[model samples]
Target chain A: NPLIAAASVIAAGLAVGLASIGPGVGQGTAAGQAVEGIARQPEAEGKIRGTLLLSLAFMEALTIYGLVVALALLFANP
Target chain B: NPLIAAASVIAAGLAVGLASIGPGVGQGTAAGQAVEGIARQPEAEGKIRGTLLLSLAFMEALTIYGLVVALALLFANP
Candidate 1:
């Protein structure tokens, strides 16, 4: 029983931590390049902005999934 | 002691690893499209880049939250 509880705790931590790495690096890269693109061409701002928004929403959802899992494990693990 | 510590380690690994997948894919997609968009209409670069920056910030925060939890588990576990 205790072991299961411990496992749940660890799992929760892992769910949150592991879930973040890819997005972190990816977001940084995307932002950096997006800025570079903007510096080169300011007229396509609306299109670029829209694309970024869409992509970000998609990426953010992944992290949220992990967060939800972790929270559930920590708070509601059976 | 050993069980918690071990769980901590595993959880830390999972947190970092799982967290990266979605963001990585999303970032790549966003960057590619942003670049393409920029090439098509360089004038809109500023707006596009600005959007990317804001989105990236939001996405990045998600990863950071996971990282913080992972670090806490590894270094400050009770």
Candidate 2:
């Protein structure tokens, strides 16, 4: 019984780590572009602001995904 | 050994959950841009959508990673 439980816990950890890979890269690329855009069009401050905010929100989705995984690890099957 | 197997399964699930983070953020950002682009350059719908989809696809890799994790968890050495 203990073996099964422990195995599940470990499995959850590995799953979260593996899943994080894509989101990390995706968000990083988005942030880089946002920064680049801001740098390129310093004059378009007002407009860029909206786009930047939206991008940030999207980026947060990945973090949320992590959070979700963490939640599952904590709550699922336990 | 049984415990280890179970651990791996749980770990894999967590990984899947964790992985969705990046794409979530990146896609959100892209969406922001898409909204803004639509507002600013209504004519560039095709271009903006193309870029947005491309970026989102990249982010989705995390989900695939998650799937692998889940499969690993499910098909453990039980």
Candidate 3:
């Protein structure tokens, strides 16, 4: 039981780290697109701003996912 | 293995956080420029927006790089 628990703790710790990947990519892509969109529209300032922020929020959700996963692994294991 | 794996996960998490800065700064610049462009040519909003999105996306690709690094660090060890 001690060994098993230790293994689980290790596994859970790893999982949380894995989860953060999505947000990193997600935010990067979203941010890049926001730039291109702005460059193209030049005039739709408000719309571009709104979309960029919205996309950022969505992308941030991935980071949140990471946090949740990390928490689950950390707290759940111990 | 557990020790190494844990370290890798930590490294990956740091990578992701570091990578995010590129996109964040990149997107912010794009937004600022887009606003400026609009001021110069109010009528070409559509074209400007399109370009902005594309540029932003390109910048975002860097962030994706970070994400990949993070994922690799996270999963590669385990």
Candidate 4:
């Protein structure tokens, strides 16, 4: 019983931890360049912002998926 | 005690590792394209960078989620 519990705990940790890495690096890189682009041209800010929002929505969902799994394991393990 | 502790370490690794892969790829792709887009249309630099910031915000949050879990497991596990 405790093994299962332990496993669940570990799994939850894994679910969230592993899920976040790619997005983190990717997001940082994107942001860095985006900032540079903005510095080069401030007038296009609106369009750039909108694009970021769209892509971010997609990326965020991936993390959410893992978060959901982690939450389920921690709170609703059967 | 040892099992749970070991599981915690492994889970923490998995959580951060697995979580990062997708976001990293996605972010990089998005950033590369955004940069290209900016280069092609320097006039749209403002717009492009704006998009990146918004998206980066969303993407970065995903990583934060995993970090939180890892921190909790390591420092707050019962």
- By lDDT, the candidates rank as 4, 1, 2, 3
Error of 2 at B66 (Å): 6.4
Candidate models: Cα lDDT each: 0.60, 0.55, 0.53, 0.61
Candidate with maximal DockQ: 2
- Candidate 2 local lDDT, residue A10: 52
lDDT of 3 by residue, A2-74 (tens): 4544555455455555434545555555456556656776555566556456446544644544454455435
The CAPRI class of candidate 3 is incorrect
lDDT of 4 by residue, B7-69 (tens): 665655445654456566655655776777677767666566556656655665676676666
Q: Could you list the iRMS of every candidate?
A: 5.3, 5.3, 7.8, 5.2
Best prediction by TM-score: 4
C-alpha positional error of residue B48 in candidate 3 after TM-score superposition, expressed in Å: 0.8
**Against the true two-chain complex, what DockQ does each candidate achieve?**
0.29, 0.31, 0.06, 0.30
List the TM values for chain B, per candidate: 0.78, 0.76, 0.75, 0.79
lDDT of 1 by residue, A1-78 (tens): 466566656665565655566666665565656655665656655565566567656666776687777655654555
Considering chain A alone, what is the TM-score of candidate 2?
Answer: 0.65
> What docking grade does candidate 1 earn?
acceptable
How far residue B21's Cα lies from its native spot in candidate 4, in Å, is 0.9
Least accurate stretch of 10 residues (summed lDDT) in model 4 chain B? Answer: B11-20
